[PDB]
Amino acid sequence: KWDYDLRCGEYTLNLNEKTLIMGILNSYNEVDAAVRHAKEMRDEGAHIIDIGSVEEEIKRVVPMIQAVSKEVKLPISIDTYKAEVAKQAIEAGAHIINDIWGAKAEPKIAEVAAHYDVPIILMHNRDNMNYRNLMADMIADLYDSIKIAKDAGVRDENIILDPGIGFAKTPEQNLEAMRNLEQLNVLGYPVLLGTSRKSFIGHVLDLPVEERLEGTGATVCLGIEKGCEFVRVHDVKEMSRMAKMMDAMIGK
Amino acid sequence: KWDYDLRCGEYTLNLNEKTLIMGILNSYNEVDAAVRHAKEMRDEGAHIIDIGSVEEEIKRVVPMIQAVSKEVKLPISIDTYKAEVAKQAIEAGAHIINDIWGAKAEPKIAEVAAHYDVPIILMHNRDNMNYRNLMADMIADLYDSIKIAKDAGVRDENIILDPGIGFAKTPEQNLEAMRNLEQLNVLGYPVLLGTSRKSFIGHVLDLPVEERLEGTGATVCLGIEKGCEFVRVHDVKEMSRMAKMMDAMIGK
Ligand SMILES: C[C@@H](C(=O)O)c1n[nH]c2nc(N)[nH]c(=O)c2c1=O
Ligand SMILES: C[C@@H](C(=O)O)c1n[nH]c2nc(N)[nH]c(=O)c2c1=O
Structure with missing residues (x-):
């Protein structure tokens, strides 16, 4: 039981x-195709819309946040790691930050987070696969992201963790991170799991990307059962139903 | 780890x-439509084909077992509780028995099982929902099926258990049986979970029977993670992929 609500400016997410x-x-064409999709997702059971060099990233992603935040009543996260992109995007209307490098590629991003008082997702990442002990190094690695974030003034309650499935991990190390996901819980934060349609599901099932829906389901179910608060998915309709059935069962 | 193989006459199932x-x-028309389906299922990743008053049950189910056992190389279970039906069906070519009353409606069925030396599935069932303590009563109830089976000469290794989801249980008691499925393991037997497209998935998701595929997925994933050796499903293609992804993850 979380004793607080995720505070996202206009909207509030109960955990x-x-x-x-x-x-x-x-x-x-771009911005309209994007709006149709957010609307569809909003209608299929989505609770958050995730919207993915420096000059061009802003010119492409700002217009989308303006449009989607205006026509879809749902919090928006900006899928970046660059500090400037993040600032511009929150000004444009993004509610959450989603950094795939966990404040480590551009430490100043955390300072953006503390500044605007927005929730931040720190994902596990690194430039190698040279682990002593996978889980333990992950936890140490994520904790290093938490220290960068806390030193920047980010409040405990605006911190979210993500094990970084599909990053800096071999096919077999990804299954291992899945199998030990609950260990992440000891750090005391909400956890977002993002496995949708990823390569390692292809490697187990020997299926191409468009046929990984049942594979993704599996990973989502396993992750909810192991205590995740969020899941980031492509197939919103299917995964929402799966999530809700899980929630009924674990007694959530 | 099971230290033995499920022995089904011609075929052998590793657990x-x-x-x-x-x-x-x-x-x-009947028997051919049935053969097409078994073949399809066999091709979608199925490992076993489950084939569902006394006079007519034999006239309908015997022809099917003859045909399917001849054209599809896979063990066949007969979905009955009647003693005579079970005998006739094993003679017709059925490898496993699948009793939804756990030897309690017609105790003589167990004697059929011991006689032909075939694997038997004892499912949990009863004519009321008046539980003191759901799980505990289940375990006591199933154990009563095991005692009837053992007294009849059924060998420990030919015993399989099934919690009886959707039987004698309210919507909320079914979620509870799911949430506590691992307790069944203490009895020392293989467990078959059968939740496919059932009413309680409808009750949680508020969806009709043809839209319960993602709901069923959830239950299958949860059940594998809680140690089930079998799952009995309608949508073989989808559930096989889900099962295999699960198995990769739990390290099976
Ligand atoms: C790789 C890409 C994708 O959608 O596959 C991606 N972007 N951002 C992401 N952000 C988070 N927090 N988690 C992810 O898994 C993830 C991704 O998988
Ligand atoms: C009720 C019916 C069905 O397919 O829904 C059924 N028949 N036999 C069954 N046998 C076993 N062992 N388990 C079941 O869940 C089950 C059923 O759900």
Whole structure:
């Protein structure tokens, strides 16, 4: 039981009633195609919209946040690691930050987070696979992200963790991170799991990307059962139903 | 780790390498439509074909077992509780018995099992929902099926258990049986979970029977993670992929 609510400016996310679904989002053609998708996702049971060099990243992602935040009543996270991109995106209307490098590629991003008082997702990442002991190094690695974030003024309650499935991990190390996901819980934070349609599901099932829906389901179910608060997925309709059935069962 | 193989006459089922999928099966039109389905199921990753008053039950189910056992190289279980039906069906070519009353409606069925030396599935069932303590009563109830079976000469290794999801249980008691499935393990037997498309998935998701595929997935994943050796499903293709992803993850 979490004794607090995820505070996202306009919207508030309760961490106890259900698994929160974060749906992944793909001029006028671009921004409209994006709005249709957010609306669809919003309608299929999504609770959050995730919207993915420096000059161009802003020119592409800012227009989308303006449009989607205006027409879809749901918190928006900006899928970046660059400090400037993150600032611009929160100004444009993004509620959450989602950094795939856990404040380590550009430490100043954390200072953006503390500044605007927004929730931040620190994902596990690194430039090698040379682990002593996978889980233990992960936990040490994520904790290093927490220290960078805390030193920057980010409040405990605006911190979210993500084990970084599919990053800096071999096919077999990804299964291992899955199998030991509950250990992440000892750190005392909400956990977002992002496994959708990823390579390692292909490697187990020997299936191409468009046929990984049942594989993704598996990983989502396993992760909810191991205590995750969020899941980041492509197939919002399917995964929402799966999440809700899980939640019924574990008694959430 | 099971230190023995499920022995089914012609075929042998290993209990350690993977989750075994049992696929549910629906004159010339009848028996041919049935054969197409078994073949399809066999091709989608099924490991076992499950084939569902006394006079007519034999006339309908015997022809199917003859045909399917001849054209599909996979063990067949007969989904009955009647003693005579079970005998006739094993003569017709059925390898396993699947009793939904756990030897309690017709105790003589167990004697059929001991006689032909075939594996038997004892499912939990009863004519009321008046539980003191759900799980505990289940375990006591199933154990009563084991005592009837053992007294009849059924060998420990030919015994399989099934918690009886959807039987004699309220919507909320079914979620509870799911949430506590691992307790069944203490009895020392293989466990078959059968939740496919059932009413309680409808009650949680508020979805009709043809839209319960993601709900069923959830229950299958939860059950594998809680140590089940079999799952009995309609949607063989989808559930096989889900099972295999689970198995990769739990390290099975
Ligand atoms: C790799 C990419 C993707 O959608 O596959 C991705 N981007 N951002 C991501 N952010 C987080 N927090 N987690 C992810 O798994 C993840 C991704 O998998
Ligand atoms: C009720 C029916 C069905 O397919 O839904 C059924 N028949 N036989 C069954 N046998 C076993 N061992 N388990 C079941 O859940 C089960 C069923 O659910």
